[PDB]
Design a protein around this nucleic acid. Structure first.
Ligand SMILES: [Ca+2]
Ligand SMILES: [Ca+2]
Ligand SMILES: [Cl-]
Length: 238
DNA sequence: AACCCGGAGAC
DNA sequence: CTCCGGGTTGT
């Protein structure tokens, strides 16, 4: 694994921007929102996930399309340590609905954003006692507990891409034009409780093809507009 | 299994 | 806010 110095990251980001629009190799294409991140990883020579460290060593690397209205940033995934499993949650709260991409395919889905301070429309909410005790509730009923490790996201390199071509098509291209270094992370207990950080569940199941469920892992996420609540220092790199 | 990489539109 | 995907890794 290469450990990238800050100066090496800054230099590489300028080189990447100077390359202009980057294309998706045919062998890579798989109708995938995450392709922006795969392309960015290639530029940094990131060959596999490391269980211990952020992609670049000291820093974790994240790419995003620069949409006018931006989806949340996914920080990492983690299964609950205790209580109901994600599959047990899916069994109870999932709902039958056609695929959004292919209307002829029937699915069972649970795509829901859960946060502190509020019940969502499915009755789900979070609270936190410590960063190591984040609890999922349905109304006043305790379901599950997460013990989250934030080590890998202590420092981030976040890079934004402009796009040309249809989203998730083989012709989509990416020009990485802006980047930020985010450091000095805050304790997350209050951020969970106040609904700044959120948890997404992203489980579905292809019923038409008689397949088993696909749990993508509970996602800890944050809106880009609220990153200054998570990190005390945000520096423009590119 | 349990992680990895990321999205959209309505009001 | 509700609602939404594509993978590989570890057993
Ligand atoms: Ca990684
Ligand atoms: Ca990453
Ligand atoms: Cl689980």
């Amino acid at each position: 694994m290469k450990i990238w110095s800050k100066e090496e990251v800054v230099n590489k980001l300028h080189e990447i921007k100077n390359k202009g629009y980057l294309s998706v190799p045919t062998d890579m294409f798989r109708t995938d929102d995450g392709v922006v991140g795969q392309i960015l990883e290639r530029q940094f020579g990131v060959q596999e996930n490391n269980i211990t460290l952020g992609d670049l060593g000291e820093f974790e690397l994240k790419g995003m399309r620069n949409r006018k209205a931006k989806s949340n940033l996914t920080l990492f995934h983690k299964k609950p340590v205790a209580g109901q499993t994600v599959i047990q949650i899916f069994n109870r709260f999932g709902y039958v609905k056609p695929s959004s991409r292919n209307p002829e395919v029937m699915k069972k889905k649970l795509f829901t954003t859960i946060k502190g301070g509020r019940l969502n429309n499915l009755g789900l909410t979070l609270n936190a006692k410590h960063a190591s005790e984040i609890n999922l509730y349905y109304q006043d009923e305790y379901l599950s507990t997460w013990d989250l490790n934030l080590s890998k996201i202590e420092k981030l390199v976040l890079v934004f891409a402009e796009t040309i071509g249809r989203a998730n098509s083989p012709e989509e291209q990416f020009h990485f034009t802006k980047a930020y270094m985010l450091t000095e992370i805050n304790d997350i207990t209050s951020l969970i409780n106040d609904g700044v950080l959120v948890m997404d569940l992203c489980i579905d199941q292809d019923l038409s093809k008689s397949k088993g469920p696909h749990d993508r892992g509970p996602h800890l996420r944050i809106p880009i507009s609220k990153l200054d609540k998570l990190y005390r220092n945000i520096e423009r790199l590119l």
